[PDB]
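User: Working on a comparison across species. This one is Bromodomain-containing protein 1 from Homo sapiens. Can you predict its structure so I can line it up against the others?
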Amino acid sequence: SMEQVAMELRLTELTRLLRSVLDQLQDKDPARIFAQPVSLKEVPDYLDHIKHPMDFATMRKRLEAQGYKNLHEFEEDFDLIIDNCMKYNARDTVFYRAAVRLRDQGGVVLRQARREVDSIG
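Assistant: Here's the predicted structure for Bromodomain-containing protein 1 from Homo sapiens:
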């Protein structure tokens, strides 16, 4: 149908905007701490601690498959990155501190993303 096509164009455009958001958030992680999944070879107990692991490569795979239907879904995944880190790692670690800085700096980007998503529809 024409309606399915219109819906698909909306999803393609949301995907375009989310890719720009993702790029902006990942620039706030210049140490690349969150770039890839935590390695289960190197952290063999990780899944005993963290039930839903997340990282920027895994988000990028979902995004490129147009797997985020709305901004809320994308934000859920970004919050997992931060929240998983702040639980597994202690306050005094470079990992926790990186997550705090990513959360704080990302908030600005996400604030305007929400306005754009609502604005453009």
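For your comparison, note: The chain is about 70% helix and 0% strand.

User: Helpful, thanks.
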